[PDB]
Amino acid sequence: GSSHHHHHHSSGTLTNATVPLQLVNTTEPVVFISLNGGQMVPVLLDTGSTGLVMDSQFLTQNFGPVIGTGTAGYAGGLTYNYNTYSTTVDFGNGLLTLPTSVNVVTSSSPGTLGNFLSRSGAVGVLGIGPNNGFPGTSSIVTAMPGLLNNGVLIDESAGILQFGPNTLTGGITISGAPISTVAVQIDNGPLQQAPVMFDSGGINGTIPSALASLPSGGFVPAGTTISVYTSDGQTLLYSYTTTATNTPFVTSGGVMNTGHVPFAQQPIYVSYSPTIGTTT
C-alpha cells in the first residue's frame, strides 16, 4: 500500500475552519495540536502517511489506557514500536475531535522520532493521507464534527490549513490514497504515465531512475524542468525547474515523490470522500 512506498529523502454547525500552518525550513509544514487538553505541540503535516504518531515524550502525558500495541516504519527511515490510545485532538478555537486513535512511540531506531523530525522541530507526525478501503486507519480529520471531517485544504504559501469541504475551484485534489497515476514530463520529453505520491513531508522529493532516465544514487541536475499533469495529459498540475538546492534524489525503482514543491506552489485539497486520484 502507500506506506510501503513512503520515503522522506534528506538532501543535507461549522462547515469550514482555518488554523495557522507554519512552514519551517522552507519545506516542513507544521501545525499545533493539543492532545487530551494538553499543551499545544508542533506536528508535521504529512500527506504521505495516515495516522497520528507522537514522539516517546508523550508517554508522560495522560492519554488514558493503552488500547493496542504494534511495530511500524516511518518514511523509510525510522523503525518503531508504539502504544495506541484513544484520545481527543484539538487544533485550537475549540476545533476538537471525538476521541480517536493516537499512537505513541515506545522505542525506535535509529534515534527517536523527534530527532528524525529535526528539520521541522515537530514532535509527532500528523499523517493526513486519505486511506480508502482500510477502515482500520484514517486521518484524524475524519474524526472532526459535521462537515469539518470532509477534507482539508493545505495552503503552505498562505500559511493556512482549512478543514471542511473545499471552498476553492479547480486546484489539485488528493483523494483515495496519497499515490495516484499522473503523467510526468522531463524537459520537453514525452509525457509518461507514472504513479506519484504527493507527499508534503517529502522535502525536495525523489524520482525513479527509469522515469527520469538518470542513474540512481544522486540528484537530478539543476536546470531540469519537471512537469506533472493529470493522467490524461490534458491539465498541468504543477511544473518547476530544479536548482542546486531544490532537486529530487534519483532512486532505483519505487515511485516518484513530489516533496514540498506542489504544496509550495498551490493550495492542495485532501478529500476524505469514498473513492488514488489527483485532479486539477
Applying CB under 5 A, which residues contact Zn ion?
A: 46, 48, 199, 201
Nearer to Zn ion, 51 or 164 (CB): 51
Report which of 272, 209, 197, 253 is spatially closest to residue 3, judged by C-alpha positions.
197
List, as one string, the DSSP characters of the chain: -GGGG-----------EEEE-EEETTTEEEEEEEETT---EEEEEETT-EEEEE-GGGGGS---S--EEEEEEETTTEEEEEEEEEE-EE-STT-BPPSEEEEEEEEEESS-HHHHTTTTT-SEEEEE---TT-TT---GGGGSSGGGGGEEEEETTTTEEEESS--SSSSEEEESSSEEEEEEEETTS--EEEEEE--TTSTT-EEEHHHHTS-TTSBPPTT-EEEEEETTS-SEEEEEE-BTTB-PEEESSS-EE-TTHHHHHS-EEEE-S---EEE-
Nearer to Zn ion, 52 or 148 (CB): 52
Is 90 labeled as ligand-binding?
Answer: no
- The distance of closest approach from Cβ of residue 49 to Zn ion in the complex, given in angstroms and rounded to an integer, is 6
Nearer to Zn ion, 48 or 114 (CB): 48
Is 46 labeled as ligand-binding?
Answer: yes
Alpha carbons 94 and 227: distance in angstroms, whole number:
40
Query: Cβ-closest residue to Zn ion?
Result: 48
- The distance of closest approach from Cβ of residue 253 to Zn ion in the complex, given in angstroms and rounded to an integer, is 18
- The distance of closest approach from Cβ of residue 134 to Zn ion in the complex, given in angstroms and rounded to an integer, is 17
Nearer to Zn ion, 23 or 96 (CB): 23
Query: 10 Å Cβ neighbour count for 178?
Result: 32
Catalytic residue among 46, 55, 155, 187: 46
- The distance of closest approach from Cβ of residue 147 to Zn ion in the complex, given in angstroms and rounded to an integer, is 26
Nearer to Zn ion, 201 or 262 (CB): 201
46 is catalytic: yes
For the chain, the C-alpha Rg in angstroms (whole number) is 18
Question: Cis omega (within 30 of 0) on the bond before 110?
Answer: yes
- The distance of closest approach from Cβ of residue 200 to Zn ion in the complex, given in angstroms and rounded to an integer, is 7
Please state the residue numbers annotated as binding site: 46, 199
Catalytic residue set = 46
Residues of each annotated binding site for Zn(2+): 46, 199
